[PDB]
């Protein structure tokens, strides 16, 4: 299970809604989201309905404004409870379709290029667990939730480029 309370206004003010599960469409309920309290679960907030647009990873804790989840705006129109995983393993590849140099991680990586000297990651195999891939180092820029499965090209994880600077496990 999980539980998040979404507030329209900064600092946990305004109209609010308590969500226990995936909600593909917040628009009837919240016209904006400027703070959130995550009681439990790892959540992905989405700028757009039906889990599209900019994605923001949130874990347990309180966020007094949208900048605290790296939000570019107060637009939150869907949210997903990310399934718990008990282990994490990801392979990153230089080229598409699992070709070229590969590196395999089981831990968080704040600076990819420190370990794998490629600015671009063209395919990846998420063998175990859910991960968040970040465009920039130190968990900045655009975020992309990765669930277990095969990603033969960067389009498969919802990005418009292959730039990857950091990545983290979805874990408590
Ligand atoms: S990814 C994640 C975050 C928080 C929690 N939690 O317990 O609050 C879980 C979990 O319950 O597995 C997972
Ligand atoms: S993959 C990776 C890159 C950078 C760092 N770092 O500390 O800067 C690590 C780490 O040691 O956790 C991992
Ligand atoms: O109570 C809920 O859990 C609830 C949550 C959201 S996010 C929107 C509508 C809801 N209603 O109407 O039940």
Swiss-Prot record:
A single Gene Ontology CC term: nucleus
Effect of residue 36 to P: In CTRCT4; uncertain significance
Listed SUPFAM superfamilies: gamma-Crystallin-like (SSF49695)
PROSITE patterns: CRYSTALLIN_BETA_GAMMA (PS50915)
Keyword Iron-sulfur: no
Region annotation Connecting peptide: where it falls in the sequence: 84-87
Keyword annotations from UniProtKB, A to Z: Cataract, Disease variant, Eye lens protein, Repeat, Sensory transduction, Vision
GO molecular function, one term: structural constituent of eye lens
Residues annotated as domain Beta/gamma crystallin 'Greek key': 2-40, 41-83, 88-128, 129-171
Gene3D superfamilies referenced in this protein's UniProt entry, alphabetically: Crystallins (2.60.20.10)
GO biological process: cellular response to reactive oxygen species; lens development in camera-type eye; lens fiber cell differentiation; visual perception
Repeat listed as a keyword: yes
Domain description: Has a two-domain beta-structure, folded into four very similar Greek key motifs.
Subunit relationships: Monomer.
Disease linkage: Cataract 4, multiple types: An opacification of the crystalline lens of the eye that frequently results in visual impairment or blindness. Opacities vary in morphology, are often confined to a portion of the lens, and may be static or progressive. CTRCT4 includes crystalline aculeiform, congenital cerulean and non-nuclear polymorphic cataracts, among others. Crystalline aculeiform cataract is characterized by fiberglass-like or needle-like crystals projecting in different directions, through or close to the axial region of the lens.
Protein family: Belongs to the beta/gamma-crystallin family.
Function: Crystallins are the dominant structural components of the vertebrate eye lens.
Protein's UniProt name: Gamma-crystallin D
Organism expressing this protein natively: Homo sapiens
